[PDB]
Amino acid sequence: SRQEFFQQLLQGCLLPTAQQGLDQIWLLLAICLACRLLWRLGLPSYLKHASTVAGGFFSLYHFFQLHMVWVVLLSLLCYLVLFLCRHSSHRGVFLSVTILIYLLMGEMHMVDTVTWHKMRGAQMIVAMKAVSLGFDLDRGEVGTVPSPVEFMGYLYFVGTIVFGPWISFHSYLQAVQGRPLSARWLQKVARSLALALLCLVLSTCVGPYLFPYFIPGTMVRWLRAYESAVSFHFSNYFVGFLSEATATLAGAGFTEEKDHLEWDLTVSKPLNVELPRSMVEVVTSWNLPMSYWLNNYVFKNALRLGTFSAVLVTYAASALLHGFSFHLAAVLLSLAFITYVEHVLRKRLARILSACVLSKRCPPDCSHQHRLGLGVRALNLLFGALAIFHLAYLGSLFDYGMAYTVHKWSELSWASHWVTFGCWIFYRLIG
Ligand SMILES: Cn1c(=O)c2c(ncn2CC(=O)Nc2ccc(-c3ccccc3)nn2)n(C)c1=O
């Protein structure tokens, strides 16, 4: 019952989960701290890149054993492709083709499934970094093609190698140049670590047992769906905050604004997903570095196909980056339709009603007549409840191929797809 559960909660799932989660990240945090301290010694830049290459090798070996060879071969192949087309204006195109072949080949089961699934996050960060550097060289954001040691240090940046957020090559070079260790930096690292541990504890203990104990038929199914979604969300938040901690602790994730340093790297915004304004905001706030990467390097390059086709291409690239599994592929394919339909419907509603009911908050200078009214707040609350409903529906899959997805979405009576279809019908009608 609830009494015995709360009698055994502390020694049962708080301390065990916390100890386990801490004991499998402490060496990575130590290597990130060593990289931060070593990069403040005034060493030459190539020595810093070689040191983080060695640290990335040791971190990849520590987390993925001998299997790390696939990430190593991906990094070597990416540098080979970048060097072969170093004088072309389509470096991002060639690198994206290389990545596509590599990742697909991996999905084709040429490599062991448990192996592919184990280190896919690191192969994703390496692929994102390589494609981003190729497109930045194409667009002129990066002036010259990097030397081998700089490229390999960028791929094996120890704050970003394991669970790290994608960072740009310029952001990596700024981390290499170094910044003074300050109280603000340490507070950022500590806050990120504390939030990570809290999210992990919530994901493992509070999340799955939320409704039977913590909180006092179709409703039951939706409650189970919601708690599976919220637990999956806190697992993602744990990874996000841990990635913030590692990246900041290695010396990255700062913004030199108006000659004022702000360690403000944000990977995930839990409040914007748990309390959502729109599903577009949810998708963006899920993994901000990933959302930026996909917008800047997939969405803008696919704009020649139209807006909707570019959205589908971006979500398919998201599928490719996170691994092709029917549940996640179905979730991302549904997310494309959900975000597109809700975005265009909220734009049309905002235009017709002259209201601040867009998928994001309006700027302080916007032409909408109704900005803070009761109807605007009611419509925004209705769309936020629809976003929570979509989150519970899509997150029910993450408590497993076609049959599991069909069964889990039939227990919810395919409600979110009907709501998305109904919202699209409403969109067309008002227009
Ligand atoms: C809610 N949610 C996710 O956001 C998610 C997830 N799995 C991975 N993501 C992250 C993700 O793919 N983010 C994306 C996807 C597309 C775009 C994009 C599209 C069009 C234009 C510009 C950018 N931006 N970010 N799951 C299970 C989930 O429920």
Ligand SMILES: [Zn+2]
């Ligand atoms: Zn407005």
